[PDB]
Write a protein that binds this ligand. Sequence first.
Ligand code: DUP
Ligand code: MN
Ligand code: MN
Ligand code: MN
Lengths: 131, 137
Amino acid sequence: PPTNAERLHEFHRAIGAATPERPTPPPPELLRLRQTLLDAESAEVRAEIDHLLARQAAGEALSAGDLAPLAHELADLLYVTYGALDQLGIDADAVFAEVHRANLSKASGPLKPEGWRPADVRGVIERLQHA
Amino acid sequence: PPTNAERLHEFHRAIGATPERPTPPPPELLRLRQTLLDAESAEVRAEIDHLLARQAAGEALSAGDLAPLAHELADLLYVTYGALDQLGIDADAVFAEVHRANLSKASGPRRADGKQLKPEGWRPADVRGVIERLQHA
Ligand SMILES: O=c1ccn([C@H]2C[C@H](O)[C@@H](COP(=O)(O)NP(=O)(O)OP(=O)(O)O)O2)c(=O)[nH]1
Ligand SMILES: [Mn+2]
Ligand SMILES: [Mn+2]
Ligand SMILES: [Mn+2]
């Protein structure tokens, strides 16, 4: 099964959207569009969360199915977040792996483990540039 | 091979934090996840602004100049998957449903800013169906 990052590549190729194979500095038009898409889904997640809190305040004992609008919007947020990486030509799974390494690694302590190394995303990008 | 949603499950087990099926959360957990989302959203916005500003100032960007934005986008992925995991909700199964509805947009037109729009007859994602099926298995 494809990862969610590979699904974004399939989406962008299917609509003729720019999706370079390697890290590519974007024109300002792409950056402003990605901001618009991120702002839309951030506001829609916030709305669904506010809703759920409003329902709990009225005593509601939510069920699993009540989470479906929120789950939806969280997935929309993933979709526009992966999408920005994909249009930058930046393999999202490679960047994620590095942020995951730094995060799982920091999780040994009680805070930083003695030999801890922060996420080196710049290094991931330079490794992506080559093939 | 492990997906990024499964990575969030491991991270939560590493920190002693998550349910195996869709589980309504207590309000304090909702407020916490919203705060993490808003924190990484702002850091992403800041990095988009910094790249737009350098471009407006006549700077020609390098691929390496994308490292801070790419970092913050991964950070936003991390706390977004983190919320789905803590809800007990399989992120990859919900993502596949949204993906199907977005692929079906391929014949639609584009907005003036580049945004892909919906073709006539487009049917939206059925996430509730996915959530219900994730309960019972
Ligand atoms: O250019 C685009 C346009 C949309 N999308 C994705 C993001 C999100 O998952 C969804 C946003 O499209 P719309 O704003 O048109 N609304 P949506 O499809 O989410 O409709 P609904 O709110 O009813 O589910 O499609 C992109 O990724 N790139
Ligand atoms: Mn949405
Ligand atoms: Mn949607
Ligand atoms: Mn961050």
